[PDB]
Design a protein around this ligand. Structure first.
Ligand code: ZN
Ligand code: ZN
Ligand code: ZN
Ligand code: ZN
Ligand code: ZN
Lengths: 362, 199, 362, 363, 362
């Protein structure tokens, strides 16, 4: 007869879906029967086969409801509601922890029986990324601490280097690791306040490829990005809550999330520079490039750019005592599993290949 | 809160009777309630807690002799200001019935206690009929009680208080006089030890 | 069957929750059993365990309603309505006292059988702070008498000093003591009228790091910050009520709130320097710096820039009389808690360490 | 079933002329609690509250249980607004000023009454200060009032010009509230001008505050786009034609822009703009006024010398009961007697005496 | 019980009221008893006493209903609906007639038993105005014939001259006479599209005091007015329909209304000049002024600038044939009543005093 708003709201939770449309088109997928749901036999997408059967009895009605969009909106709101609470009450560590588990869960599936990801190929990516920076794993750990601590006036890292030098690759992966958003300050300033709003309730934010003024000798186009960042020094400092808007509306006065700031070799003011607690200079390295040429699968499957790879690095390097007490259990469970399939010999060989630039799995 | 033109002296005067003051060495523990530091002439005690002050005389003074207890701020800069209870404490239901709600110093267990609100000096004080040392003891002990922490007016010992014990006859003339610094806190022991420790 | 909107509002009212998404998520947690509440028997968030029991039966329904979103709105409106009605009827001093009864109300937790803060740590923060500016407690006291009086063309303080000199910290603190908002007048002007509606019903306002001009000689990028304030003379004065407006909602015509301004030693127009009663010049003090290096916890935990810190400093030095009557009671109730928890000698030691450049806790 | 009475709320919004929806929601919610227990009544601190609680106490309870308090408060405000658009389109500018003066006297009765804090002596001490700002002050206030009431095309603005801290503002503010208007800021980008202007809809007068000009770079005065913007609002300052004031993205007003004051520093007032200004007062640094205030701290601290009452008083003191509308003449008299019964002309002179000597007014 | 939406509507139509907030107020007055109302007996408001008794029941009920604003809307839209149907169906001439009628109606009352208008004072205006320009009566007529024919490429008149030349006064009078709107093209070009929308469904438009370039040689500030006009060529032309908007949406595509343009001896482009079918250069005339410095009432009552005055002028001079048949009868009625009121000698005298600059009523 009637429909259960609560069930949809709940399904939206177990999926942490904050997109009404997706939520909609997705729940409607439970409309049909499960008894022969081909999307279930093939086990593609857990978001469907893990809940369909359970919500079948409430999706055959939802398909007839006259307020589909209205209902979904409430679920999504609930999802956002949660995020809000878990950003004013949980500890940054607890946040980074909850994040990891979410990643590990994905890994279990992508590396399990139903998955399709080749553990070897990914691990191989771990090696490529480890040849990107001296003591990469430690940097990854260092970054994680930086973000979790969120020490005022010391929250941002600067990635500076020529075109195609890994600045992004690493930045991107880091982001997926902690979970956050990539903002653009190069865009007009009339949409700037709308862009800066994306960074709400976000763990960390990333200003990707910011443009600067000083630097035409290096044949670099001028931009307002850098000059913009300097104006948002209030936001970067992280000392006093800033006001962020959204959808021509007033959302919240929170502390701006910490993050990375990648940019070409442009000039950087003293006031801005001071906001950066750490600066990493990337430089194009032949072998790293020739390695990918013979290791296509590393870019095709977007491995060297995912946080899951970086996680499969902290687990293959960092000691258990470093992870949050809560995840230690699972972490160790992975160090073993990972160990049984990889001898420091095989791995060492992969890093070596990268050095020679002959493809990891070669 | 008006100032006073007068400024009660604090000069040590034993008098023609050799008047002094004795204090119960209550050690420097933690559960202390009232102690004395000879090196500091300071008396660390708790709020509204018995404070035994011993009166020592070589020759028992005449009858009708009284002992006045007044308080003044040790620092000259505020020595003209009137020593009284904080705005809060003077609004507490701690009225024994005899002592006025604005008086700092009080007397415990002496029905013949008299509180004086000097209309000329605005000063506050408490007086009681002097009694000869009861058989068995060589001195007359008086129980005092302060109704305001020294933190209510400065915390960091911004306003140090000094108690003035006067020995006067019926008319009200000086016979003897001693004075000691007072501090009302929550840990007389810990506070005495540390301060004496500062040499 | 039907939800008690009145009840939800009663919650938001005791939580001062003026955030539809916050309130939404928070109340929804009450939808669960209070018999086995892990968040209560573990007492982590008062806003939860202190009201779950009472609001349990209600939330139990609120979770099956189809207007959770809406119902929460009204609740916030009420909270907002109150905040307004009060900024008109209560006197300035009656507002600080109302604020303090919230900080001390929070301190009753932080330093309790449920809190998670080391009272010893904070007193140290106070010590550090009390070394930032001469007679700091007095300065903080004066600032209050300057924010409560609100004398026209005499309602703003200016912190003008070099990079990382403590100017922001102190500001950020005072701002939390009196409550308010921080505005960025550095961004463009085409969309700063909303970035001003945030001052609606706020006790004070803070303009964090304002970029001026003519600072080129000091390697300070030019910004339209200082010049933008000048175009708001009637705001900083407080003689006539200006018009603040939020995104197509609440276009209040009030009198701009007083506050502070922090900038990097730029040039101030004589027409603005007159709207600044007192100007404190901050200088980077090395000893304070090193002290922090050895007292990391003062930053990681954000204490030298917390309102609670200064308030404590006030409960420490300032006389009972200085505080309002209706609070003197709860003040002594603390002047004793601190007198007990610490010692004049102990504290002395602290400022000594800070003065020496070593960790406070030694 | 016991429903709510929108009508009763509307009535409250009116008897208090509440135009703020939220502010209304807050005031009516206070009528939710018990009357006999209201501490905010027996103490008497807010007229707007105790004068209607008992009455609205019944409806309040029902209100506090409605699922759309906002709507009700909205319709109650949309009314108070309508009763504004009408009067500002049917009453005479003379009647308005009078009504404004009534609400001004109402806040004056309670103000200096037993159930309120206000030292009648302090204010008169202010009136004295004000009367020392400009020669024949009380007369200036009238010349302005009339000028505002008449509303003569191309003759509706006064240009208060002077340096930093000269009084311009203190006065402009006083006259402002005295008549009831709005302070506008035309210094910020015009890209938001049309909205800032909308604040003038249904207003009696308008006061453009500092309005930065250009050219005064030799005087060390930051140049702005203020003045330049006014010159673009010529027809706005004129008064002949009706302007189109936009607000909240929906144009709901096509009226003649109201008159008012304009303050500024020693900037350059363009030929075309200087014309729209009828009279021009030149304020200057008054050392003795300064010294007096430093010793009369209460004046500035309580915002008297810049209040719509400090001016109305000056009138009740000087001006004849004749110049006032006969629809409130009685009241004006009741006050004149009241003021003399309380003050001595010789005393008031003593006030100005000190204000001239640069000494605390009172005593 | 349920208020009659058709009654509030009817009233609105009988008052050509399109302001929702106004309608509500107007109607809310009829809620009270008419038996003893003041404003209703003092007969000082035509739009009030004329409908109170008819609209009293639906007012005491309306004052109760909860959908007030919603109703008034329905009503106002009906009005706008009518005007919209008139603009597209009625002939431009019929439009002027309906205007004149509503115009006369006002006269009938303001110049009757009830009303503070003084027929003698107004006549003075008719006179004063007749001294403003040579053959003033054959001008107003020429103008009306231009605004009616609305010939493509020959729709605008250009009043050009110094300050206090009467340009506006006449411009305003002509405006009121026909009924249009005054657009300000001096404002920024960004919002230039919103003002133009006010011209939707209007008989004529008036661009008052447009600013141009090249005026420094005469102490005139620069402006974008003129340029902006030269950008709305197809608007002034009236050849092709223009697309105007207002409610944040393309509300209507119509032939922009014809009109007048008043400016101060600025430089006009030949492209904009060939767009003005007629140009009138005004000059400051001492006597006209002195005549006013003695006949203040003319201004203190906005007569010489009123549109009623110009209608009195035509009625006075113009023959009963240049008008519209249907209005002829009423024209005569006003010619006779206007005759018994004044003698050619008196009227003549008036103009004399004007030429002498001493007071039209001396
Ligand atoms: Zn399925
Ligand atoms: Zn006390
Ligand atoms: Zn619980
Ligand atoms: Zn009440
Ligand atoms: Zn009537």
């Amino acid at each position: 007869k009637q429909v259960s708003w609560k069930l949809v709201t709940e399904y939206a939770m177990e999926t942490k879906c904050d997109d009404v449309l997706l939520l909609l088109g997705m729940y409607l997928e439970f409309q049909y029967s499960f008894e022969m749901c081909l999307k279930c036999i093939k086990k593609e997408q857990p978001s469907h086969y893990k809940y369909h059967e359970k919500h079948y009895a409430n999706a055959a009605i939802f398909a007839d409801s006259k307020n589909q969009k209205t209902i979904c909106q409430q679920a999504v709101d609930t999802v956002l509601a949660k995020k809000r609470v878990d950003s004013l009450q949980l500890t940054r560590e607890q946040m980074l922890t909850n994040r990891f588990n979410d990643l590990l869960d994905r890994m279990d599936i992508m590396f399990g029986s139903t998955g399709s990801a080749d553990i070897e190929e990914w691990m191989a990516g771990v090696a490529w990324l480890h040849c990107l920076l001296p003591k990469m794993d430690s940097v990854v750990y260092d970054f994680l601490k930086c973000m979790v601590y969120n020490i005022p006036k010391k929250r941002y890292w600067l990635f500076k280097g020529p075109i195609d030098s890994g600045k992004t690759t690493l930045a991107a992966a880091l982001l997926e690791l902690c979970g956050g958003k990539a903002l653009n300050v190069n865009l007009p300033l009339d949409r700037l306040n709308f862009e800066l709003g994306v960074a709400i309730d976000q763990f960390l934010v990333v200003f990707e490829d910011v443009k600067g003024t000083g630097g035409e000798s290096r044949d670099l186009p001028s931009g307002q990005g850098i000059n913009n960042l300097d104006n948002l020094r209030d936001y970067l400092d992280g000392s006093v809550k800033v006001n962020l808007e959204k959808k021509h509306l007033n959302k919240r006065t929170q502390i701006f999330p910490p993050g990375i700031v990648t940019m070409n070799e442009y000039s950087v003011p003293k006031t801005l520079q001071a906001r950066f607690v750490k600066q990493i200079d990337f430089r194009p390295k032949d072998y790293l490039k020739h390695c990918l040429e013979r290791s296509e699968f590393l870019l095709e499957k977007r491995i060297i750019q995912s946080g899951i790879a970086l996680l499969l690095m902290l687990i293959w390097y960092r000691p258990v005592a470093e992870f949050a007490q809560s995840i230690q259990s699972r972490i160790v469970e992975w160090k073993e599993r990972l160990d049984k399939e990889f001898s420091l010999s095989v791995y060492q060989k992969m890093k070596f290949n990268v050095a020679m630039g002959i493809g990891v799995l070669d | 809160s008006p100032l006073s033109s007068s400024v009660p002296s604090q000069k040590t005067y034993q008098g023609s009777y050799g008047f002094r003051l004795g204090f119960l060495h209550s050690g420097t523990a933690k559960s202390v309630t009232c102690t004395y530091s000879p090196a500091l002439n300071k008396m660390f005690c708790q709020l509204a807690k018995t404070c035994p002050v011993q009166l020592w005389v070589d020759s028992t003074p005449p009858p009708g002799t009284r002992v006045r207890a007044m308080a003044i701020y040790k620092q000259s800069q505020h020595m003209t200001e009137v020593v009284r209870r904080c705005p809060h404490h003077e609004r507490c239901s701690d009225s024994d019935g005899l002592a006025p709600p604005q008086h700092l110093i009080r007397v415990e267990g002496n029905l013949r206690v008299e509180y004086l609100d000097d209309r000329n000096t605005f000063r506050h004080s408490v007086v009681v009929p002097y009694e000869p040392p009861e058989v068995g003891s060589d001195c007359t002990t008086i129980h005092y009680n302060y109704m305001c922490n020294s933190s209510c007016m400065g915390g960091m010992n911004r306003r140090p208080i000094l108690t003035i014990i006067t020995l006067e006859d019926s008319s009200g003339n000086l016979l003897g006089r001693n004075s000691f610094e007072v501090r009302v806190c929550a840990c007389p022991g810990r506070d005495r030890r540390t301060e004496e420790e500062n040499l």
